[PDB]
Design a binder for these strands. Structure first.
Lengths: 96, 99, 84, 108, 92, 104, 97, 78
DNA sequence: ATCAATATCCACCTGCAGATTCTACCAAAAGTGTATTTGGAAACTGCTCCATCAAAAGGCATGTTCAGCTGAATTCAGCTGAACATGCCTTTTGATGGAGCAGTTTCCAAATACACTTTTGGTAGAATCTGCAGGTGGATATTGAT
DNA sequence: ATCAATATCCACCTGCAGATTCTACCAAAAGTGTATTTGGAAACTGCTCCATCAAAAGGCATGTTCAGCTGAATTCAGCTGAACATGCCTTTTGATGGAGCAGTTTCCAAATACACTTTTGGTAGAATCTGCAGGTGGATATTGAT
């Protein structure tokens, strides 16, 4: 009699308050945002899946995700996403 | 007199109006009936979540709105301002929907 | 229940006109409305066909918003806002 | 044992690294997933969320509202060259279109 | 190293056209055809199973994928052929 | 005794199975799926080869080349829909000249 | 003193080139252009011959297709002469613009 | 280098596309389109090269790049 | 048009060569036979949502009139792009050596899967909060007649 | 270069639907301790790549000439937009039963996971053969022109 469905709304809302601390988001707009995250997740992961396969490699590393990001995103968006991801990975491996 | 806007003026008023808003432009109940009719002629005894009908209307209207932009470009390219079936067919053809 | 017939004609001339307006169209020849109905009907057949195929494959009798969302993704018309 | 740190906090991120790791293992993308791949991907997803919400909040401000609605998302995407290309095959329900009238249509 | 669908394309060629040959470039076209359709069918059946939270791609996923991917009257025949191969295979 | 001969197919069932498992499509793979999929790939292969053999014969040729695969695909409504985003190298295009461009 | 009327040899060339499948851009200039463009992304690269051939086949198929849509746009405007605004209209409707 | 893509070669491509008459500005318009096409495809291909840690663009790198761009090519490895 | 003349094009054969087809033999898949795991079909069933109904009301659809101005036809002349002969240069073609380098083979230390045992972070609602949709009125335009 | 008719702002107002916050258990993260890989980091092949070098020709660049196509200018029949009257049917609020999703359990037919035994399909030298491209000779197509 109970059943539960995950979402990115919690983390969307946090990042929202970081950029516009005064601003809310209606559930319809949060709906869009959830579609966006799930979409890009699947495009990155799917391209990463293919990259690994083309190279007879059974593992998706941060290096795959990074090539996928460079193939999927244009111009400045790619440069900045590559920065954030590299930074996050080194911070994570520095145990930081 | 009575007062009377010249042909073309209300049309531009309406482009500005509907380009400003986001509400659906086809009526809900008629469109729900179209969907149930097409669906039934494909499989019987089907039920629809209301959001499923809403998703189809959102997509169907986003598609037609997008097609009329392309159609409008084909009209203007022919040095007209009246869209005609030639334009929809030319747009559709180049879109690769059906070459 | 009750026979469904000719419902394409409930896509009225004023509804097609408003959609042309959002699309930036100023003048509309009188043959546009029947071409639009035809184009809409092909669009809906193809999407409803794939959606219902997702339904049948799940052994359901109810077409869900997900069914329609997957149908549209198949067709390269990805939709945001019904992914629930 | 030690007190538990989330891998997000370790990564300096708002987005959930552990969940992204689980969605990778479960999504049938490869036999194995390295430790840095969910970190890097949760980072890219949060950066893109941040860039969209930045421009959406601005549109909300320009329209004198404090709550982002789909319109604001749509104006943010369509007006940014790069989000518009990233999402040029995507339909945002209840987003409408950009005000745009071809010049030749305006009163002569 | 470097396997191909060539010998199988050639066998099918002799069945339908025992008189006819095939250039190596044409054989490459056919290889590309088979890998493509293979990935489209497999990719869709993969989605079908994930959507319905299954871990197994069965011929039911392949068939729906074919229905979803092939123009009717190629899906009909493909569905025929596939059903027929699965029964002939199970009966033995 | 192979699974292909058992399924009555020229196409390799065992290979189609190994490619499904190693392609990261699902965790598990049923036994009929490589049979089904291999039958579908053989059938569509026969359909193209038939039409392309015809295009060879109608060109006074016995060896199918890329041009004949192109004329088979593009002259068939369904193969054309299925392969409408595919480029066949060295196939060229169908002869076709818009009426308006003809003399007189 | 023999001379063919304008359009007559052109139609003749339409029939000739719609019949054949040979590449129509010369191979070396194209290889130069590929390597020049590629040099701006990664330095000191080498190309399989089959990679150059793939690119030239994709590239000529793309251009031939785009000339078909361009031709249709010129015909739509009651002309028989393709113009840049025809290429632009096709490129835009195709959702590459 | 792109001027090496010559007027008569652009005529020939137009002819296979069914074009009877060509405006004198088509040739420069065509070279610009061809250059965007090659940049997009090659950029993607070299990204597959570099990922593979190679110095040689392979035909498969092009085929994968064309597939990403929705321009699937048959005859060179898929 | 069915006059004379230029070039195009189309069949029919013809013989050397570049690709095909066919012979001959060794690893890596594919097939078996046992012995497990486990996924998800089958069987009550809780409980969300879907189809349907009623009923009242005003937003819109429908049809009509009327004429503004748009599309479609026609004409015309300048000038752009096709056809062409001319002549030279860049492409093509091709054994030659050399070398950069994919692709293999041998490891092993870092990194991943695994696996139960504990700790939270997030979800599903109750509870508390508040933008703004929608209703009204004057600035301030905007449009179109005179 | 003005009024008048009408549409468009824009700000100020108020509670209702719709957020944002407040609680409360579970699934799903994180911790920790072992058991497999992985795929890099070296080394040394053999391919296939680039770079010349030198011919010849096929192809492109160039300039002339004019044919005919594009585009500008003008007309006008009638299509389509604006405005109006009229009243239908969608929209909205609100039940109701019950179909059919979705959730728990329970558990065989079908799947993975080994460890061996045969088999096939990919290689690389051997064997024909299809059609390219080049001869001829004969109509066809085009274009000028009593």
């Amino acid at each position: 009699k109970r059943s539960r469905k995950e979402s990115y709304s919690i983390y969307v809302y946090k990042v929202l308050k970081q950029v516009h601390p005064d601003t809310g988001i209606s559930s319809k707009a949060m709906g869009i945002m959830n579609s966006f995250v799930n979409d890009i997740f699947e495009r990155i992961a799917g391209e990463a899946s293919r990259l690994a396969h083309y190279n007879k490699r059974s593992t998706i590393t941060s290096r795959e995700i990074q090539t996928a990001v460079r193939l999927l995103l244009p111009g400045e968006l790619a440069k900045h996403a590559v920065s954030e991801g590299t930074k996050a990975v080194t911070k994570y491996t520095s145990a930081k | 007199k009575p007062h009377r806007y010249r042909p073309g003026t209300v049309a531009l008023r309406e482009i500005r109006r509907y380009q400003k808003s986001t509400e659906l432009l086809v009526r809900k109940l008629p469109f729900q009936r179209l969907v149930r009719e097409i669906a039934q002629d494909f499989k019987t005894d089907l039920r629809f979540q209301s959001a499923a009908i809403g998703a189809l209307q959102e997509a169907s209207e986003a598609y037609l709105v997008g097609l009329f932009e392309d159609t409008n470009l084909c009209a203007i390219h022919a040095k007209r301002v009246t869209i005609m079936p030639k334009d929809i067919q030319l747009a559709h053809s180049i879109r690769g929907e059906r070459a | 229940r009750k026979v469904l017939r000719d419902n394409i004609q409930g896509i009225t001339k004023p509804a097609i006109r408003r959609l042309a307006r959002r699309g930036g169209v100023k003048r509309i020849s009188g043959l546009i409305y029947e071409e639009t109905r035809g184009v809409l009907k092909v669009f809906l057949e193809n999407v409803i066909r794939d959606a219902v195929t997702y339904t049948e494959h799940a052994k359901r009798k109810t077409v869900t918003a997900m069914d329609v969302v997957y149908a549209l993704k198949r067709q390269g018309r990805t939709l945001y806002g019904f992914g629930g | 044992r030690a007190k538990a740190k989330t891998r997000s906090s370790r990564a300096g991120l708002q987005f959930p690294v552990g969940r992204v790791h689980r969605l990778l293992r479960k999504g049938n993308y490869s036999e194995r997933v390295g430790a840095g791949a969910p970190v890097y991907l949760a980072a890219v997803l949060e950066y893109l969320t941040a860039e969209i919400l930045e421009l959406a909040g601005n549109a909300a401000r320009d329209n004198k509202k404090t709550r982002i609605i789909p319109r604001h998302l749509q104006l943010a995407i369509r007006n940014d060259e790069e989000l518009n290309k990233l999402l040029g095959r995507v339909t945002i329900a209840q987003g409408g279109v950009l005000p745009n009238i071809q010049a030749v249509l305006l009163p002569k």
